[model samples]
Target: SMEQVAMELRLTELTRLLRSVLDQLQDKDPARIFAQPVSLKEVPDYLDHIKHPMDFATMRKRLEAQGYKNLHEFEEDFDLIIDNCMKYNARDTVFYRAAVRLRDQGGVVLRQARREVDSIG
Candidate 1:
């Protein structure tokens, strides 16, 4: 039941976050190109293709193009989603571990990007 909840929550949060990010980008830059929507049905397959950490800009761009504006907002929602997944999805340990690792890496990339943007201005 917990795993089910986590799966549902994670999917929901991801969808919401992605949408918000996309909306923001739509406002700031009308000409930005974005990848296709990354949906829940495609998650498992996508995970398999990831050999290294995700590029934060790519992740953000993909999600933002869908409408995810605030990383912090998604992070909070994802925390809850991950906590539930860890408690209930032990059988999927490798998958969850990869998620956590990439999430942290994304945070680092976002921070670095922020610093670079700040320095430029």
Candidate 2:
């Protein structure tokens, strides 16, 4: 079954690589603003603009739980974090800058992981 396939195919090196990517991104966020989910109470307009929200806490939790079946699945969530910030905030905003840096650096790291994972696969 595909469900069993997903459950069985836990690529160990890919998981560790994903965690390293997460660590780099989280470290870049100095104020820890992107560490947790955005509070709807504080920014009521957040959900209005961003349909799918992503954060480091949520990303780490999912990674630990083996929620992602592969690196591509993990990449989607990573992209979402960057996308959400870019979509909701202006270019001058800190969140936007952080997302930009994350996108640039994280993307390179992800591709490197991709090459290694493909070799292993």
Candidate 3:
């Protein structure tokens, strides 16, 4: 039954799509700085500044739970990953540089995903 025309993705398709995007994000950052959440023991002030913390590890769990209903939802988490980094770390710091690079890379990945999804329709 054709229910929607906006390239609506079922659970399986959505999971695969998100997994692919996540893989791309990880591949871009081999250092794995964003692989997990910021260590509370290392930087206790992180939570105080960033109320909304996000990382790849949590994203994987969220994906398994079908937390993301669409591509934009996944993108929101992705954006948070970079936003938190840039916000918490200084502009002259290594973490900030990593965040900037990842931000640019993420933009490319998302645009590529958008094109791929659109082509499927």
Choose the strongest candidate by lDDT. Answer: 3
Best-to-worst TM-score order: 3, 2, 1
Where is the poorest 10-residue window by lDDT in model 2?
5-14
Instruction: Please state the error at residue 13 of candidate 2 in Å.
Output: 4.9
Candidate 1 vs candidate 3: the TM-score winner is 3
For residues 1-121, could you state the per-residue lDDT of candidate 3 as single tens digits?
4656333456667778889989998887888989998889988778789999999999999998878887888999999999888888899998889889988888898998888766753
User: Could you give the C-alpha RMSD of every candidate to the true structure, in order shown?
Assistant: 14.7, 3.1, 3.1
Among residues 3 or more apart in sequence or in different chains, the pairs in candidate 3 whose N, CA or C atoms overlap within 3 Å are none
**Candidate 2 structure lDDT:** 0.80
Off by over 4 Å in 3: 1-9
TM-score of each: 0.32, 0.82, 0.87
What's the count of clashing pairs in each model shown? 17, 0, 0
Model 1 TM:
0.32
Would you list the C-alpha lDDT of every candidate in the order shown?
Answer: 0.45, 0.80, 0.86
Question: Ten-residue segment with the worst summed lDDT in candidate 1?
Answer: 28-37
lDDT by residue for model 1 (15-109), tens: 66455543443333222211233343846564454333222354555464544434565445444433433443354576456446544644555
